[PDB]
Amino acid sequence: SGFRKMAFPSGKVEGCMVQVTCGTTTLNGLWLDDVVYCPRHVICTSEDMLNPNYEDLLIRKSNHNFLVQAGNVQLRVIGHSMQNCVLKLKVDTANPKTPKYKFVRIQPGQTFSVLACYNGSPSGVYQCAMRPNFTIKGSFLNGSCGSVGFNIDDCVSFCYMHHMELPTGVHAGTDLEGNFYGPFVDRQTAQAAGTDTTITVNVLAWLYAAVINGDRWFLNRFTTTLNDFNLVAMKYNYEPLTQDHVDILGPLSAQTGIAVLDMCASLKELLQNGMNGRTILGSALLEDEFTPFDVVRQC
Amino acid sequence: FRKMAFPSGKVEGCMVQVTCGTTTLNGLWLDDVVYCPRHVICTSEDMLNPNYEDLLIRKSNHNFLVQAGNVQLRVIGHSMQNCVLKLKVDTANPKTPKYKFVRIQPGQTFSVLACYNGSPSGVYQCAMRPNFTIKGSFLNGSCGSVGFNIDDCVSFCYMHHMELPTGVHAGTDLEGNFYGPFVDRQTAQAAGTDTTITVNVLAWLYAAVINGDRWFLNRFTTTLNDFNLVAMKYNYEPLTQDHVDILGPLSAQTGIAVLDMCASLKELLQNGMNGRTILGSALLEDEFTPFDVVRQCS
């Protein structure tokens, strides 16, 4: 009984966080080799944020307008450029703590750890999933912008950088090439996240993990078609299932005896009846932030 | 509002692998000592009725196999402090942080760095349950995994020893004293009835008010004695006058007295949540201490 939600160990990311200051604005940066990456809105005042002209603002800056601090060691900015929505500050010293790393763009439903930082100091770490509406439910107070998301495989894969907090409380950001996830923009305009839906393929991998661990109370004798299940799932604000999800679940339906569409019939019955005070793997709710990959490679 | 763990970088550098004969588990490498569960000197057939003090006489320095990644460490002496083995090695750990051994109390929170054969694999935040167990994720190979808080100073407070059949885990402080009535033997051991940490639930409801989620608030107040009557009916740790004092800063920031907030909680247990959520949860969280709420919010 128990499958807790673990984050990756953060040490390899900790020695890459720095502080970047421009004018009166200070946020977090990421120091890899001889480049500091950070959100480009660092060059904005609060006046500029309603309608920022980022090209106009950056042509007016010099290298000495950017103060970068790795603890007490000041770094000298030696050049700068803009890639999409991320600023890249070239510095005179390479980070001796640079891990083996990669940049990846993720899709909704994938999970990663976040190292939440304030003024270049790490303060905490948590595991989350990219929601289907391309937002993340996290705990980011003011000054966490530029905090990064990663997976570790010795090879650190950076997939996310925090830019913006949305009025509904959720957070929005880019990949490390500076491209926003979702329809969002780095302006203070009214930006509406879509409906957040449950990640169906993730609930199903978790229920497969349940039968392997020993829980079976939720199984039924029924099976369903993909089209019929998706018609019911819509009504509960669940993401529709595709044929690609079915094949990703296949080794789990091999370790167990339960066909995917059979599992889908049981999920349909949980949605309609509830839990009745019971639990599945110690949880009183249907969990959707465990991906098939994580489950397959931990059973 | 998420359950955040402390950054693990300063502890990662202290984890090593200890092998004695056929058993491999995790150790903690501080200055020139390796700390690990003393049951690493036992075979699977020695766990019935181990005589640790006679089994340790058998062994010599060369029976212990200590590994810090690729580097290999040499045991030059060994010793027992209660339930923890202390192996003296030949080289100091140059990554030793500023640290301290503390024993904590039930209801308090800390982070755990889960490890397998000396390699860190994950980190999570948990609370010591009132029955002295932790609900965690350790599989075989994670004995000697350590729990900590960060204040520049790392306070180490826990070391995993055993997994109980109900999926809960049990351990010692770094001085080898068990949390709870367990022994380091392979035998039937049961964890007591777990209770809900009421002061942590209160801290979390204060957090929900800070986030503007204020619907469970009512006009009523109760008394300490009346609340505990309802508390232990529903299996809630009794509330003490010191508990009221700890919640003081959250009572000033919000403007809602502890006994006032207690009347909310008392109504949430009897009447349920009326099919509504607090902080997106239909479930009352008890693994955020008061001081976590101050840390994460103000």
Side-chain angles (χ1 to χ4, degrees):
Chain A
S1 158
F3 203 74
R4 212 108 97 94
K5 197 182 290 179
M6 292 193 327
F8 291 101
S10 53
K12 291 178 176 57
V13 190
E14 286 166 46
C16 302
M17 301 309 298
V18 300
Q19 170 178 230
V20 181
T21 306
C22 181
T24 69
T25 311
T26 299
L27 51 75
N28 306 289
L30 186 60
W31 183 21
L32 297 169
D33 301 319
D34 64 334
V35 187
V36 174
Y37 306 79
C38 72
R40 71 176 174 180
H41 71 74
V42 71
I43 72 179
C44 280
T45 63
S46 309
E47 288 78 357
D48 300 314
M49 288 299 293
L50 278 179
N51 284 281
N53 193 325
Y54 282 104
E55 312 84 40
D56 177 62
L57 295 165
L58 175 42
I59 195 65
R60 301 174 186 263
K61 299 286 167 179
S62 179
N63 292 329
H64 69 88
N65 294 138
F66 300 104
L67 160 66
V68 189
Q69 268 180 261
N72 321 306
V73 185
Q74 169 172 336
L75 312 181
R76 159 167 163 250
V77 177
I78 208 68
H80 59 259
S81 50
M82 192 174 53
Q83 192 191 344
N84 306 118
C85 293
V86 163
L87 212 54
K88 300 159 74 136
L89 310 160
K90 192 177 291 297
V91 294
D92 62 0
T93 179
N95 182 7
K97 282 172 186 157
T98 304
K100 189 173 145 201
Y101 73 89
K102 279 158 59 186
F103 289 169
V104 301
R105 179 161 183 103
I106 59 156
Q107 298 299 309
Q110 303 164 305
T111 50
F112 53 94
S113 304
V114 185
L115 179 65
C117 302
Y118 295 97
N119 296 328
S121 290
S123 66
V125 63
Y126 61 91
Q127 179 83 353
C128 67
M130 173 71 90
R131 307 299 306 173
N133 66 0
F134 300 100
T135 71
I136 77 171
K137 65 179 294 289
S139 182
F140 285 158
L141 307 169
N142 291 344
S144 46
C145 308
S147 292
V148 292
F150 60 90
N151 286 276
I152 289 167
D153 286 310
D154 277 320
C155 192
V156 182
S157 296
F158 296 104
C159 58
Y160 177 85
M161 179 175 265
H162 182 234
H163 283 244
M164 303 289 301
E165 194 189 71
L166 301 174
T168 62
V170 295
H171 303 164
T174 68
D175 63 22
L176 273 293
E177 292 188 350
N179 292 301
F180 262 93
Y181 289 100
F184 304 115
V185 294
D186 51 356
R187 312 174 55 185
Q188 217 80 49
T189 50
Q191 321 196 55
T195 300
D196 196 22
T197 47
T198 309
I199 306 166
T200 308
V201 67
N202 281 8
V203 179
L204 290 169
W206 186 66
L207 286 178
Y208 267 115
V211 305
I212 292 155
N213 177 292
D215 284 330
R216 294 173 67 92
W217 62 263
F218 47 91
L219 293 187
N220 69 7
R221 68 194 217 264
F222 294 117
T223 184
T224 188
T225 74
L226 204 56
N227 308 276
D228 281 353
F229 168 76
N230 282 340
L231 274 297
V232 186
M234 308 282 172
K235 316 286 172 213
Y236 299 91
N237 283 337
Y238 265 59
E239 273 297 300
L241 209 69
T242 84
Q243 194 63 51
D244 293 302
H245 295 147
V246 175
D247 305 339
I248 294 171
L249 289 172
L252 286 171
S253 68
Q255 201 172 324
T256 78
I258 320 295
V260 178
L261 293 179
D262 196 348
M263 199 55 97
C264 287
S266 300
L267 174 57
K268 173 188 139 162
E269 187 170 277
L270 279 161
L271 292 177
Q272 78 168 0
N273 298 345
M275 307 283 305
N276 270 31
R278 308 178 80 147
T279 47
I280 290 156
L281 273 65
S283 177
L285 286 179
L286 298 188
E287 170 71 76
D288 81 344
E289 292 200 335
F290 289 114
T291 65
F293 175 86
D294 288 321
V295 166
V296 168
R297 170 176 323 247
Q298 200 172 13
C299 64
Chain B
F1 199 80
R2 284 236 184 203
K3 225 178 282 181
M4 288 209 294
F6 285 108
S8 60
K10 295 178 180 74
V11 180
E12 284 167 46
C14 308
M15 297 322 293
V16 299
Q17 171 189 243
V18 179
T19 292
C20 182
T22 183
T23 315
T24 291
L25 56 81
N26 304 284
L28 182 62
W29 184 21
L30 291 170
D31 313 295
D32 65 340
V33 182
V34 176
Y35 306 83
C36 70
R38 69 172 179 182
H39 64 72
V40 74
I41 68 169
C42 294
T43 71
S44 294
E45 313 291 315
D46 278 313
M47 292 301 291
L48 271 292
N49 194 83
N51 189 303
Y52 288 106
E53 190 269 330
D54 191 84
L55 293 195
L56 200 60
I57 289 297
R58 294 283 187 179
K59 293 291 177 35
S60 295
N61 294 332
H62 46 71
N63 295 127
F64 298 97
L65 282 297
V66 180
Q67 278 166 357
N70 58 3
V71 167
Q72 45 174 345
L73 300 193
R74 287 281 170 82
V75 189
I76 56 170
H78 55 266
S79 180
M80 233 177 49
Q81 183 175 11
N82 304 300
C83 286
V84 138
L85 203 66
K86 278 143 72 174
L87 309 170
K88 191 183 286 181
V89 292
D90 61 345
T91 56
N93 185 356
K95 287 182 174 291
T96 301
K98 191 203 177 311
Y99 77 90
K100 178 176 56 143
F101 291 165
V102 299
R103 175 166 185 97
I104 58 170
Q105 302 172 236
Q108 284 194 260
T109 56
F110 58 98
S111 299
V112 179
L113 181 62
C115 297
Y116 286 91
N117 303 339
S119 64
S121 53
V123 68
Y124 60 99
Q125 178 94 337
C126 71
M128 166 89 81
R129 304 302 312 178
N131 61 3
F132 298 98
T133 69
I134 70 156
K135 292 166 94 42
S137 182
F138 304 91
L139 276 296
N140 269 325
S142 42
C143 288
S145 299
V146 297
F148 60 101
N149 288 280
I150 297 193
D151 186 314
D152 58 0
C153 182
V154 180
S155 292
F156 295 106
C157 60
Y158 182 81
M159 165 178 277
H160 182 243
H161 285 237
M162 320 278 288
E163 163 175 325
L164 304 176
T166 179
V168 307
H169 301 216
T172 62
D173 59 31
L174 266 294
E175 288 171 332
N177 305 297
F178 264 92
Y179 292 107
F182 315 100
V183 303
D184 51 337
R185 297 159 164 220
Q186 177 51 43
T187 177
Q189 304 193 69
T193 58
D194 203 8
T195 59
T196 297
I197 306 146
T198 313
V199 63
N200 287 3
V201 174
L202 283 170
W204 186 70
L205 289 174
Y206 275 114
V209 173
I210 293 192
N211 278 94
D213 201 1
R214 55 209 307 150
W215 63 263
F216 48 87
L217 297 183
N218 55 42
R219 80 175 60 238
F220 301 110
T221 310
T222 197
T223 55
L224 182 69
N225 301 79
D226 276 10
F227 174 77
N228 285 327
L229 168 70
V230 184
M232 71 182 153
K233 193 265 174 181
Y234 292 93
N235 269 327
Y236 265 58
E237 192 73 11
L239 204 68
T240 74
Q241 184 49 240
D242 274 298
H243 283 159
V244 176
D245 307 332
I246 315 295
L247 293 161
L250 294 175
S251 185
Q253 168 161 194
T254 62
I256 306 171
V258 169
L259 291 76
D260 191 4
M261 183 74 88
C262 285
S264 288
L265 175 56
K266 168 178 167 176
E267 182 172 356
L268 291 179
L269 298 176
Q270 284 157 342
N271 303 117
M273 214 157 296
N274 305 279
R276 322 178 53 183
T277 67
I278 297 157
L279 272 188
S281 164
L283 280 297
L284 295 189
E285 172 57 72
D286 73 347
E287 293 208 326
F288 285 91
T289 75
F291 315 189
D292 294 343
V293 170
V294 180
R295 280 199 299 100
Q296 199 170 333
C297 294
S298 65

